[PDB]
């Protein structure tokens, strides 16, 4: 018994799952070869036995959020405000901690539309919409600071508690969901990253949980693909079940009929592969969900989808 607690997945349909890389619901399953791209997200990362990796944390509304205090407005561009960051749970940020950036920090390049809000000790408040540019030279969260931009040029206070609530993309300039920010700015390498992931057996492709996030203007499918839904990460953190091999065989199952629709490989380091080819969404019955079947090895041959 000891050291062999059985592994399980939560009982949740696709309409009951959340994206772990942007704070919205899952819309569909998706597969693609992503030919030539390095897939290395830092949010939504966990081992199957419950160790969170990268910048991953547990609270859904802290995904892509920021907290801190504004120490100064930029003198020659009053749309820009210097935010000195804390952790999203309110504790001070320790740059010496062995993570790439404060937990929850965005893990992709974009102009992110959102709202900057404040509440003073006397309960006077203000909030203004604007943009967090994760590609900016001044996006240096691992050093403790980022720049916020707003249309408002006067009505934000210095040295008062501040939060950034993300909403979506402002436009598509610089948007690339697989391009990591430089968390310490220009000429400095990222540290303590969760590793890139790829299929390791011929005929297989990654399977993603995909959301189409809001866009304020332009043309885009707004796709944000995560490797594990947030609820699976929360489940593994609680359960802490050991992994006896490299790969768990899982099956998408109708719970009323028992019919198994397809099977997939769930890898120890926290991602899914399927036997499939091409770029396509995957339509599943609204009532089904993945169930654990058995433990196998990296070279197990899946039935084709």
Binding site for ligand CHO (CB under 6 A): 79-80, 111, 130-131, 133, 136-138, 147, 149-151
Q: Which residue, 19 or 80, has its beta carbon nearer to ligand CHO?
A: 80
Query: Shortest gap between Cβ of 79 and ligand CHO (angstroms)?
Result: 4
Minimal distance, residue 22 CB to ligand CHO, in Å: 19
In the complex, what is the shortest distance from the CB of residue 225 to ligand CHO, in angstroms, rounded to a whole number?
A: 25
Residue 53 or residue 147: which is nearer to ligand CHO going by CB?
147
Rounded Cα gap, residues 278 and 175, in angstroms: 23
Of 273, 261, 209, whose CA–CA distance to 17 is shortest?
A: 209
Structure tokens of 173? 């300039």
Q: What span, in angstroms and rounded, lies between the C-alpha atoms of 277 and 68?
A: 45
Q: In the bound complex, what is the minimum distance in angstroms from residue 129's beta carbon to ligand CHO?
A: 8
Nearest distance from C-beta of residue 236 to ligand CHO, angstroms:
36
Residue number with CB closer to ligand CHO (94 or 155): 155
- When the beta carbons of 62 and 150 are compared against ligand CHO, the nearer one is 150
Residue of minimal CB distance from ligand CHO?
Answer: 149
Nearer to ligand CHO, 73 or 192 (CB): 73
Nearer to ligand CHO, 136 or 273 (CB): 136
Q: How far is the CB of 251 from ligand CHO (least distance, A)?
A: 46
């Amino acid at each position: 018994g000891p050291g062999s607690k059985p592994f399980t997945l939560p009982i949740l349909t696709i309409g009951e799952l959340s994206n772990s890389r942007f704070p919205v619901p899952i819309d569909e399953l998706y597969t693609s070869p992503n030919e030539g791209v390095i897939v290395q997200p830092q949010n939504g990362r966990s081992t199957l036995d419950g160790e969170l990796l990268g910048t991953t944390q547990l609270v859904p509304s802290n995904i892509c959020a920021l907290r801190g205090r504004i120490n100064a407005q930029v003198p020659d561009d009053h749309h820009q405000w210097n935010l000195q960051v804390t952790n999203t749970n309110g504790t001070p940020f320790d740059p010496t901690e062995d993570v790439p950036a404060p937990l929850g920090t965005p893990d992709f390049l974009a102009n992110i539309y959102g709202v900057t809000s404040q509440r003073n000790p006397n309960n006077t408040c203000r909030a203004h919409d604007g943009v967090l540019a994760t590609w900016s030279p001044k996006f240096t969260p691992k050093l403790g600071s980022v720049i916020l931009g707003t249309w408002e040029e006067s009505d934000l206070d210095l040295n008062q508690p501040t939060r950034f609530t993300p909403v979506g993309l402002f436009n598509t300039d610089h948007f690339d969901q697989w391009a990591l920010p430089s968390y310490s700015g220009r000429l400095t390498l990222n540290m303590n990253l969760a590793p890139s992931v790829s299929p390791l057996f011929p005929g297989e492709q990654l399977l993603f949980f995909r959301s189409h996030i809001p866009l304020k203007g332009g043309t885009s499918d707004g796709a944000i693909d995560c490797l594990l839904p947030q609820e699976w990460i929360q489940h593994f953190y609680q359960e802490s079940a050991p992994s006896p091999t490299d790969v768990a065989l899982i099956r998408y199952t109708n719970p009323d009929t028992g019919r198994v629709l397809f099977e997939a490989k769930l890898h120890r380091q926290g991602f899914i592969t399927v036997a499939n080819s091409g770029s396509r969404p995957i339509v599943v019955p609204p009532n089904g969900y993945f169930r654990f079947d058995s433990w196998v090895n990296q070279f197990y041959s899946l039935a084709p989808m």
